[PDB]
Amino acid sequence: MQVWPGQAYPLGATYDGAGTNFAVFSEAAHRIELCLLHDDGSETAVELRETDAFVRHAYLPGVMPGQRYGFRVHGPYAPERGLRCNAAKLLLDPYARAVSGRVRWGEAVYGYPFGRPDARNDLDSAPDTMTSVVVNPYFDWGDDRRPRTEYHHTVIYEAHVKGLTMLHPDLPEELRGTYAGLAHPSVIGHLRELGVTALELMPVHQFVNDHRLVDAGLSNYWGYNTIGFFAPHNAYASWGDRGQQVLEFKSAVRALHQAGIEVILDVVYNHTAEGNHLGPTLSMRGLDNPSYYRLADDPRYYMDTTGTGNSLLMRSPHVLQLIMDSLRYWVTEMHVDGFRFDLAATLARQFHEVDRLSSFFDLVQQDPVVSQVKLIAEPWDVGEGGYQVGNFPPLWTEWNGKYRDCVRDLWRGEPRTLAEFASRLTGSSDLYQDDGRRPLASVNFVTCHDGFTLRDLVSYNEKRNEANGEGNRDGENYNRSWNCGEEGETEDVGITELRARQMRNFLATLMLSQGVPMLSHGDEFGRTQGGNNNAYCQDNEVSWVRWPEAEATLLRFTRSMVRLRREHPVFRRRRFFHGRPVLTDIAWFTPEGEEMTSRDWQAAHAQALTVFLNGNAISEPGTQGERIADDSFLLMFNASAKELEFVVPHGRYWRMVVDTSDPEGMPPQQGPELAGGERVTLAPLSLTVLRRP
Amino acid sequence: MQVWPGQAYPLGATYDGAGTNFAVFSEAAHRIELCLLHDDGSETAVELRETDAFVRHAYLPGVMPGQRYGFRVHGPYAPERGLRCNAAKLLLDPYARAVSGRVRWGEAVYGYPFGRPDARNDLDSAPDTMTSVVVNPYFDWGDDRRPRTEYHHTVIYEAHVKGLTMLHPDLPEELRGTYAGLAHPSVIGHLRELGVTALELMPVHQFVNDHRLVDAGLSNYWGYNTIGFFAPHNAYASWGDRGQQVLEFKSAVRALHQAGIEVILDVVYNHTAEGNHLGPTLSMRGLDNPSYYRLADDPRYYMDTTGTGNSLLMRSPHVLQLIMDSLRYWVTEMHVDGFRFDLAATLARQFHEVDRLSSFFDLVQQDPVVSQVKLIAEPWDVGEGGYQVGNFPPLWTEWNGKYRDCVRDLWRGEPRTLAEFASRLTGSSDLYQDDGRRPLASVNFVTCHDGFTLRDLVSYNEKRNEANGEGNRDGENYNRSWNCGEEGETEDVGITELRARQMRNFLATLMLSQGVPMLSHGDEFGRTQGGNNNAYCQDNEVSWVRWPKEAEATLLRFTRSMVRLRREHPVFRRRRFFHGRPVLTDIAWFTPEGEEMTSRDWQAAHAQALTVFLNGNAISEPGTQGERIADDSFLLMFNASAKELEFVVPDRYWRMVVDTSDPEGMPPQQGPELAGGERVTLAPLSLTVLRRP
Ligand SMILES: Nc1nc2c(ncn2[C@@H]2O[C@@H]3COP(=O)(O)O[C@H]4[C@@H](O)[C@H](n5cnc6c(=O)[nH]c(N)nc65)O[C@@H]4COP(=O)(O)O[C@H]3[C@H]2O)c(=O)[nH]1
Ligand SMILES: Nc1nc2c(ncn2[C@@H]2O[C@@H]3COP(=O)(O)O[C@H]4[C@@H](O)[C@H](n5cnc6c(=O)[nH]c(N)nc65)O[C@@H]4COP(=O)(O)O[C@H]3[C@H]2O)c(=O)[nH]1
């Protein structure tokens, strides 16, 4: 064995042609050893003697890709001080670019004996842990330009890697549920058919199946439990896990880009799968516990603003570095187009408060590689002062939780005031105008992975997560949902016509709103989870997508509605409306036909709207200063539980181009052409859009 | 004119091929405009309407390099709230790649009327201000190999651009004092002959001549008062200022890099040339004053932890972005090999205290472009708790001012210096071992740009800065210097021999000490500033270097040859610290008596003589390929006594390789062989080195 001192950069194992340079960090490690696993277990351990700025490194010539390796950190095991170092635990490389194997859940991976979490577990973690793998970084991106799709053209399709394709009757069994199947021409074509411009891939950072989930029959399905912020999840890899999963992902990206679809993956930097103090010792708890994790006062115990065991120290540089070194890795090495942060408020907690001047934001705001990709956030967490919708720095885009809630309530029949829903159509002027942002700062969505799918949104009052093994105690207890007549599947055509048409209203409201809509995967086919509103553990047919007449008219409804937003730049505006000076650009009307005053705006019980969107008055430039022209539209909302009669504003004509009411799809089909003062009766819980050419 | 919305990245005027894209930041600007200057002083104004996260921008097709431009920001003038925006002033671009012309000091560039600080100046600053210029970023750096000289090989040579070459009887008059003159083969030849491996360039960031200094007959010479952290100082350019200066500096880097010399820029990010209030509104004060500068708890006034007017807000990311956008720019666009930071404690002041976890340090530690270039700091600033020698994060290097003070005290004969002298030779084990650093974290230096030059350090007891006009009140008041028998130029052969040989002791101790040495420019020819110890404003014979035409060349071949002995022998540049004890002896301290010292005779009050044995076979360090570093064993003999002490050699034979005392110069001239037990009368204030393998 030949060991050269190597270099401290870049962190992790990098293959310099001849051999591999390993660089691991621990500022509280007396000794660190690099273990070279063989095909028969059997470490070949090497001490990384060279410590430079607390990074221990060496260059081992002859070591090549596919080499299974890990670290053994000889340090003090003193939970009283917060150090849980253990040289009996084969730690992963946090910067591992490909991790092989799965966690063999037992007494050996934990670092404490199963009865005394105060003591030391001198059991070898090697045969039961994940192994980091050396990776040959070569990949030939040919013509691979990043499709820098402008923000006001985006249609984000939230989809899971395994759930999108496992039930596709078009891919071989080998590709069903993996990255390569996501790159099949039958799947990319379907998103092309749907019109989406950015694929939001639920976490692909390799995660661990929770021990509590595994010793219950279930497994971690969503994967918001990552351990390697640099390695694709080896379970979504058909080509193998010895560094071939990073090949699948890179090729699945270039195949998506070859059709013009952006890859915005889901990142979970707020917590690790090592969980709380009762979790395993896999990667970081064994490297340097107090410099990676937000230790609670009384270091033994962890603070957790994510509700999932632990949280990361967002003030230590060695964590911020690891997060950006990850974010840049997926932009430059994996060619990812954007990021969506789960529980993004946790990243802003520099000390305890949600600091929008925290080093995380300042870091992301300045770095050229990361500040240019689409930065999307779930702008809250489960800690004190967590709800931060409308507070992130202006360089960010937020999941508009105030959109999903204040629109779910509208078609729910709630007396949620019109002005609440009205600003959400305008693109949350209240939330994002004063911060210095644009309507494109609101990632509008009605459904997502959390809560009900779009069909279960109109099929269930409350959750049915008894299958999750937690006794219906997990997930949202109330989703602002309405079962439309009967909770669950019903043969009655009365509610069936209602539900599938309520589905139409949510899709029409979503594509007619301002900002950036997002669709959970399967809502084109009326995907259903049986009332399970928290499917993080259902890695089964509950959360797969059922592909192959009612599930095709709703599909061609969605396809043709996204076409309307694409064709017409009014529903995707680059600035806010103002409605009045002291040709208006937006006019609000009563179904009676007369303009709305301030009293009837704050009217207590009101459910009907008629919004005029001017097409001549998009006070915005095009790419080359061109004036953006469009047809004028006339949106007629009616959340009333009774048929309401809508009057249009006299002498000139109109063209109804949208109507939720008929079970054949009005975006798909054609419309009767209405006139100015025309009496037009509109069904209860319906929508209608006109068009003046 | 044709004005496209364009991009918000990158900040500044970036040329693309068709035209230029301009992007300026202001979160406190109701309107920003882009003034395009012609050669007849006329403006072509363009509103940069398209704000994007407070960065206003437009793409102007047809605008090409050499286009002088500026910004005018319409905003509320309200120092009571912290705003000093004034459209009357033509603001520079902080991301200026090239700034042309100089500041025409008048009553125009102040932003306030000269008699009322809280009023508003409405005088057009355009004809009196500096002009940012669009640059064509093309350069064909050919085979540029960044000479990634190791840290245990570095020899930093602090040299000014104008001082190094203005008096060279080799360069053309046009090249003297400019960037290209620095790249002349006669200059890079002298740097080669010397042994330097890195050129510390005193600030090349474009600074402003202080009005206090222009209207007093002087000028800002050192240049630690800068406005453009992206433009090279135009007054060091013999090729022009319309962007032509960036061409000089780039070619001045490839010329040095061709001869294997690193350009380690000196940067001043703590303060700006706009100073406090009562100062000019040039670049940032008019753009967004409150989010760039550390305002006081009276936003009208400016917090000043540098004693030079103002200080920057190292928490607002728009500043942090600018500092890294700048630091990255010089690395990946100007091919600069490292940065030396001015008053680098100010960069750590996130709110008031000198923070270890300052967002700046977290930012620099992580960025791959900047964390890899040589990061060196002067670790203090004039604020509370500013003295931070040995407190910067372990990735950093520091001017070890304690080395300077201790070695000056020893050769002064200060009372109890031998103890400390020993840890400053060991490489400041007290200041750097516990931090997790190496001896190379101590940039050892006796003289620098500040204080005395090496000749004045042994010729003057106190400053003679009457040239600076402040009545001998500026600069260090006691520099811990000794005049060696007469203050100023003397004819005495006694003092002259004492001084020139005292020069031989600072140079021998500096090159013999652990860590990276540092020589200020000119000390090879015995450079003299006449007793002026603060030459920030002397742009004249006082600080320019005299090139030699016997004593000024004998000292030169002493210096050049001692860099040889540090090169030829890895003991003096050890990669680790000494320990000297098992429980191989790699260091041994002996008394001139010839016996090993004890703890009582280590803290002996009256001691001025030392004999250190440096083991050459016991270099417990691996080489690039794991080679065992071998060397001859060296024996150093220090005598800071005022009289001739008799030194005894321990243990065979030894060879006198260095002797400060004889004026023939005995770094290069060989010495006799000492027995190994025999006494040797060593002269007072002399130093000797023995060699034996
Ligand atoms: N950033 C950085 N700094 C370095 C490095 N190597 C040495 N330093 C410095 O070198 C000094 C002496 O180490 P030594 O000659 O090997 O003598 C050392 C060494 O033999 C051993 N030691 C310390 N750490 C280690 C280690 O991690 N592995 C091994 N095998 N020995 C160690 O005990 C002696 C005293 O150790 P220290 O208190 O640490 O004092 C250390 C430490 O301050 C390095 O690779 N990176
Ligand atoms: N010539 C000029 N006029 C200005 C400017 N700022 C505000 N206004 C004018 O005053 C109207 C209301 O401004 P607002 O509060 O910023 O409300 C703004 C603002 O919230 C939003 N927004 C508009 N433009 C931008 C932009 O370029 N960048 C970002 N991040 N947000 C914008 O569009 C909304 C409506 O703007 P308008 O339809 O144009 O109607 C605007 C505009 O005519 C400016 O910098 N230059």
Numbering used by the authors:
A (entry chain B): 1 to 548, 553 to 586, 593 to 659, 662 to 705
B (entry chain A): 1 to 549, 553 to 586, 593 to 660, 664 to 705
What did the study's authors say about this model?
To elucidate the molecular mechanism of c-di-GMP binding by GlgX we crystallized the S. venezuelae GlgX-c-di-GMP complex and solved the structure to 3.34 Å resolution. Strikingly, in the structure, a c-di-GMP monomer is bound at each end of an antiparallel GlgX dimer. The c-di-GMP molecules, bound at each end of the GlgX molecule, make contacts to GlgX residues 31–51 from the N-domain of one GlgX subunit and residues 430–437 and 628–638 from the Central and C-domain of the other GlgX subunit. Cation-π interactions to this guanine base are provided by Arg31 and Arg49. There are also two hydrogen bonds from residues in the Central domain of the other subunit to this guanine base; the main chain amide nitrogen of Gly436 hydrogen bonds to the guanine N2, while the side chain of Arg438 hydrogen bonds with the O6 atom of the guanine and also stacks with the guanine base along with the side chain of Arg579. Specifically, c-di-GMP binding leads to a restructuring of two loops formed by residues 432–442 and 579–593 within the C-domain region bound by the second messenger. Thus, these analyses indicate that c-di-GMP binding acts as an allosteric regulator of GlgX to stabilize its active state.
We demonstrate that c-di-GMP binding stimulates GlgX-mediated glycogen breakdown and describe crystal structures of S. venezuelae GlgX, which reveal the molecular mechanism by which c-di-GMP activates GlgX. GlgX is a 79 kDa protein that contains a putative carbohydrate-binding module (CBM_48; PF02922) and alpha amylase, catalytic domain (PF00128).
